[PDB]
A paper describes a structure:
Rac1 is a major regulator of actin dynamics, with GTP-bound Rac1 promoting actin assembly via the Scar/WAVE complex.
The asymmetric unit contains two molecules of CYRI-BΔN with each monomer “slotting” against the other to form a compact dimer. Briefly, R161 form a hydrogen bond with A192, R165 and M166 binds to Q324, I168 with R320, N169 with S321 and Q324. The crystal structure of CYRI-BΔN reveals the presence of an autoinhibited dimer present in solution and in cells as revealed through pulldowns and PLA.
Numbering used by the authors:
A (entry chain AAA): 3 to 145, 153 to 299
B (entry chain BBB): 7 to 147, 156 to 299
């Protein structure tokens, strides 16, 4: 255990304990839909405007929290990748370190997908911040969320899967500043994790210690996580017929789950992927995703 | 030529159809909220798409028309600003082009007032574009969509289009003095104020259709002026007299001019200047 690597483990662990609180905040996000729709439709009504404002300021407090955290997560991940791609694989000598770094990467992706699932099912978030930004521009007449931050946040929340796109960008950037390392070291981290996830899902017998909702829910979300990172940073990507990812098998295990459990995860594959809409991707895997 | 005049009346006849389209605009708000919140239930995703395709048909109409309106104005400015003002000789022609200019601005504000009060339009098209990207998976069957998205992100889309269209015309006719354009705007603004301020309580001049016309046109022209005039419309020594202009607005039944005050808040250039009266900001707040 290096001082550098205990610093990354320290850093990421603070980040990951905060991550459950972020999920709490997002889960309890009411939205200001009602207030805004009425305020907008009766713009002379000075009372309906205070209401909409009152309701929106707290929510944009959370939206700022979420976005700021995404920057912390972004950095935490590129931390992990640096550490967890540099030294070769050692099952005998240095396993505890690898297992520990693998654990934290998986836990990042578990949060990431859970956050994005809830975002995609929240009708309010984009409209809330849209109303905020215009009402901010009214109050600035008579005279902190500065303009350029707000433009970044607007784009963040325009994303189907904000957190996951943040992380695919963060992974694309990592390979970029480490052209010295072969691409395989990163791609093989993602591909092994994807494959191990599939094993834990597929290999266990019916009704063993391995087949609890907690395990299945976790492994599905890590799998889809790393599949999509891989799709972005692997030249040929995840959808090519002889890709080490076997997308077809990954989608099939998703299709095997209760519909409402994994519809968020299927949408991530639809929207936040790079190579899905390619002439060279199986019309069968297209078929499955429409 | 006289074709330019004839090209705008066919446009100004279509404009009244566009407005009744926007008035009848259902919106797919509820349908989409449900589809988003139950993304697995394919029935709700069918419902939402069904409701949305017709609305996005209208949204495409409105944007297309904004292109026609845009060129129509640039024509009118061409015709108006090329010739000296003739009070005697060629007045009928002047008044005719002026009236068409005023009628463009009447539509523009009426469209933008309704847009601003329609909570559906932006969300509708947002859902469309997302759901279009799903269907392109299997190729069930771009540039324009990005244009439309920006258009409908504007507080006052039509008026923004005309502000851009006026900035454009000034730009591409540097040979004409800027005053030739800005004096057209400023005189119309001032004539509008006269029609509103001058007549007695009970007169042939005091009817809703006059007041409602003149307030739109006025707000129209002083916003265009603000964009193209170097000093802008808010300067203490401007022939626009902004303060005086806002006063006639504040004198109205608030619900009938709240759209017009929002235009001034959002679609202006010079409101937020260090050198713009605190009294003028006081009034828009």
């Amino acid at each position: 255990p290096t001082e550098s690597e205990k610093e990354i483990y320290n850093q990421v662990n603070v980040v990951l304990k905060d991550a459950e609180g972020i999920l709490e905040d997002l889960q309890s996000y009411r939205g200001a839909g009602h207030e805004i729709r009425e305020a907008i439709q009766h713009p002379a009504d000075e009372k309906l405007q205070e209401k909409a404002w009152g309701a929106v300021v707290p929510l944009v407090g959370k939206l700022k929290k979420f976005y700021e955290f995404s920057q912390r997560l972004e950095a935490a991940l590129r931390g992990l990748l640096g550490a967890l791609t540099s030294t070769p694989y050692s099952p005998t000598q240095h396993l505890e370190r690898e297992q520990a770094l693998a654990k934290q990467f998986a836990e990042i992706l578990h949060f990431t997908l859970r956050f994005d699932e809830l975002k995609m099912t929240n009708p309010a978030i984009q409209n809330d911040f849209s109303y905020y930004r215009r009402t901010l521009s009214r109050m600035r007449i008579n005279n902190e969320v500065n303009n350029e931050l707000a433009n970044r946040m607007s784009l963040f929340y325009a994303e189907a899967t904000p957190m996951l796109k943040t992380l695919s960008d963060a992974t694309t950037k990592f390979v970029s500043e480490n052209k010295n390392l072969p691409i395989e070291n990163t791609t093989d981290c993602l591909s092994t994790m994807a494959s191990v996830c599939r094993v834990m899902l597929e290999t266990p017998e019916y009704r063993s210690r391995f087949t609890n909702e907690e395990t299945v829910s976790f492994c599905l979300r890590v799998m889809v996580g790393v599949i999509i990172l891989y799709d972005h940073v692997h030249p040929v990507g995840a959808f090519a017929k002889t890709s080490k990812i076997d997308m077809k098998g990954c989608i099939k295990v998703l299709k095997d789950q209760p519909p409402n459990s994994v519809e968020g995860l299927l949408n991530a594959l639809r929207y936040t992927t790079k190579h899905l809409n390619d002439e060279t991707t199986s019309k069968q895997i297209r078929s499955m995703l429409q």
